[PDB]
Amino acid sequence: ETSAVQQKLAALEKSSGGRLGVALIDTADNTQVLYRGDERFPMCSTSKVMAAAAVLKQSETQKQLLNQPVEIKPADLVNYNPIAEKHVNGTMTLAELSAAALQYSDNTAMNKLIAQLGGPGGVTAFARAIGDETFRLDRTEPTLNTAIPGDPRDTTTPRAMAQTLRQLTLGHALGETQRAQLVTWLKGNTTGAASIRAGLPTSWTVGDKTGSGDYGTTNDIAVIWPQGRAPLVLVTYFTQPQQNAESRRDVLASAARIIAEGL
Ligand SMILES: *[B]([O])([O])[C]([C][C]([C])[C])[N]C(=O)[C]([C]C1=[C][C]=[C][C]=[C]1)[N]C(=O)C1=[C]N=[C][C]=N1
Ligand SMILES: [Cl-]
């Protein structure tokens, strides 16, 4: 059985030509609205949230960990290094790496977070520790973006990611200083203007993390504070049947516009 919300999302999916996954959690009453909410999708750069959160968790017991400088070598650079390239043969702290990964989607920064956690499996272990049984990170940047249909590597479901994003930002999977820091980072994101944010009222505060990959994969996950109302969490994942498909951030904006009706 479908609601009008799910019917609108299905029509958007049909017009888009791809596969759309949506999960909305309304924290006023803990209700969820799902569309393909238990299907796996490639996370691409939305996985940077889990990596940054895992480092934040380590910092709860190592109080100066975020200020620890990490060396950036020429050989560390990968395909998209807008911040890290300014620090070659220098350093970035774990806080600076987290901010670069989250707010600019820097892939060298993400790889340093993964390395701090002992590899992709360390990010997955953190997910399991906070109750996320679905997330899996298998690869570093940039190979985590291959986004092959049917491949479970580097995937999660919309429901699982929405639940985790809620617990990380509004709940207490992290300590208070750390939860607030993650919110500060997400709110300052620079890459999200055409994605979920473009489908919501400008008066709503949004923290989000985008992602992109092969198969035209176009993703965004967000924590949202509507005016006068309890906050929401929204995941919008989108992937397409052909490898060379173009990005479709407009589909995410359209999904957000649908979800916002009545909220
Ligand atoms: B993330 O893992 O989603 C990451 C963020 C991006 C801004 C650097 N994405 C990528 O590394 C993708 C992978 C990709 C592979 C094949 C097809 C499409 C995408 N890279 C990019 O989107 C990209 C775009 N412009 C410059 C650099 N990188
Ligand atoms: Cl991105």
Residue numbers in the entry: 25 to 57, 59 to 238, 240 to 289
Give the exact sentences the study uses for this entry.
Bortezomib and Ixazomib bind to the active site of CTX-M-14 to the catalytic side chain of Ser70 forming an ester with the boroLeu warhead. Based on the high resolution and the quality of the data, we were able to refine and to compare the occupancy of Bortezomib and Ixazomib bound to the active site. Both inhibitors are observed with full occupancy, but the N-terminal end of Bortezomib is disordered due to conformational alternatives. We see a different conformation of Bortezomib beginning at the central Cα atom of the inhibitors. Obviously, the Pyz-Phe moiety is not stabilized by any specific interactions and can adopt alternative but quite similar conformations. The Phe reveals non-polar interactions with Gly238 and Asp240. The inhibition assays with CTX-M-14 revealed an IC50 value of 13 ± 1.2 µM for Ixazomib, but 67 ± 1.4 µM for Bortezomib. The fivefold weaker inhibition rate of Bortezomib resembles quite nicely the observation of an elevated degree of disorder for the Pyz-Phe moiety of Bortezomib.
We have utilized class A enzyme CTX-M-14 from Klebsiella pneumoniae as a model system, because it is the most widely distributed extended-spectrum β-lactamase (ESBL) globally. The clinical usefulness of β-lactam-based antibiotics has been significantly shortened by the emergence of specific bacterial enzymes referred to as β-lactamases (BL), able to hydrolyze and functionally inactivate β-lactam antibiotics. In this study we show the crystal structures of the β-lactamase CTX-M-14 with covalently bound Bortezomib and Ixazomib at high resolutions of 1.3 and 1.1 Å, respectively. Ixazomib is well defined in electron density whereas Bortezomib show some disorder which corresponds to weaker inhibition efficiency observed for Ixazomib. Both inhibitors mimic the deacylation transition state of β-lactam hydrolysis, because they replace the deacylating water molecule.
